[PDB]
Amino acid sequence: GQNMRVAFMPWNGYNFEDSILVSERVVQEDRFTTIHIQELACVSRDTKL
């Protein structure tokens, strides 16, 4: 994972029951970005027609 500077206080109910909170700085420096590679295919057949 990554390192990040962490605090500890209740906020305006955004950490009510185990729910964690970010800034935009952790998205601007893109430290939590992943890539994915999916797969698509197509087949060609012969029918009776």
Partner: protein
């Protein structure tokens, strides 16, 4: 960066998590002086002592 709920510490008995957080405060606590001494760009033999 990250804010989270401080009411998860005693009722999971995870005093290891509070124990982890202090070291990382020290982990950059050596690193920042290195960044304080590299851009200010003092010397080699000042650094090798530190």
């Amino acid at each position: 960066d990250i804010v989270l709920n401080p009411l998860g510490v005693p009722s999971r008995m995870n005093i290891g998590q509070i124990l982890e957080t202090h070291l990382g405060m020290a982990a950059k606590g050596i690193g920042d002086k290195i960044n304080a001494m590299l851009k200010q760009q003092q010397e080699v033999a000042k650094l090798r002592e530190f």
